[PDB]
Amino acid sequence: ILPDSVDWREKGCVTEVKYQGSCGACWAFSAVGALEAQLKLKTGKLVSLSAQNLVDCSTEKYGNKGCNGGFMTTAFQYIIDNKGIDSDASYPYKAMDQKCQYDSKYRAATCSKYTELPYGREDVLKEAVANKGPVSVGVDARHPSFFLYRSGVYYEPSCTQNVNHGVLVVGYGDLNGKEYWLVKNSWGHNFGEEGYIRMARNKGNHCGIASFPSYPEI
Numbered sequence: 001i002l003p004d005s006v007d008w009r010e011k012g013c014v015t016e017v018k019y020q021g022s023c024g025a026c027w028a029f030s031a032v033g034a035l036e037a038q039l040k041l042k043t044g045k046l047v048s049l050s051a052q053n054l055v056d057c058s059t060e061k062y063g064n065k066g067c068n069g070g071f072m073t074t075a076f077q078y079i080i081d082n083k084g085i086d087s088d089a090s091y092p093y094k095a096m097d098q099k100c101q102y103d104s105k106y107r108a109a110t111c112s113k114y115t116e117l118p119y120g121r122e123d124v125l126k127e128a129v130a131n132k133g134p135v136s137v138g139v140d141a142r143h144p145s146f147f148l149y150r151s152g153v154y155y156e157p158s159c160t161q162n163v164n165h166g167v168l169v170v171g172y173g174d175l176n177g178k179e180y181w182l183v184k185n186s187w188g189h190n191f192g193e194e195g196y197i198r199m200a201r202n203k204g205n206h207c208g209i210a211s212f213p214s215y216p217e218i
């Protein structure tokens with residue numbers, strides 16, 4: 001039995017909304033966001049993790065291209081292999097590709113593994129968000145409506161399952177009969193509902209939100 005609605009922000013596991021700027025680091029922010037929640041659950045401290053650390057270090061060997069794109073899963077594996085990721089405070093985001101400057105003396109979190117959910121199963125995604133924590137996902141944000149989104153439950157007739165933008169599901173619920181996923185974006189606090197966007201849930205894997213979900217564990 002799963003709760004009808006969930007919002008991890010109420011549980012203190014979600015940091016402030018970040019602004020990626022002109023650097024395509026959505027994948028990095030999605031990844032640190034998921035781990036930030038696990039760090040809170042494990043240690044009791046809420047700490048923004050270094051997305052820059054990922055942009056700069058989880059590079060070619062992980063199939064990532066810094067400001068030109070990357071994967072949340074391989075980002076998680078990097079943290080695992082690297083035996084750590086620095087805090088955002090010690091390794092600030094500059095919205096540009098830099099030489100890897102990771103240092104274990106600034107480590108703020110570790111990762112032991114990650115789990116990729118089965119393709120397109122929103123019911124499995126719901127279970128993971130309710131019982132595990134925020135889940136990193138990819139969505140189709142290629143449409144004008146996404147950029148122009150301001151409030152309510154987002155539904156785009158032209159959306160596809162071909163995802164291109166990494167975000168973080170921090171909860172779910174329903175708005176007057178319209179079910180949705182509560183999504184934390186990395187386009188600053190001025191985008192959508194102060195950094196967040198509620199996307200159609202249980203509407204045939206709308207915009208591929210349940211296409212490639214994954215979450216890390218400490």
Ligand SMILES: *C(#N)C1([N]C(=O)[C]([C][Si]([C])([C])[C])[N]C(=O)N2[C][C]O[C][C]2)[C][C]S(=O)(=O)[C][C]1
Pocket residue numbers: 023024025026027063064065067068069070071072137138139163164165166167
């Ligand atoms: C973000 N910001 C952009 N996207 C990505 O990083 C996506 C994330 Si997913 C589809 C959920 C794995 N990844 C890529 O675009 N990759 C291409 C390069 O190799 C790694 C994966 C940044 C790139 S973008 O401007 O094309 C869209 C937004």
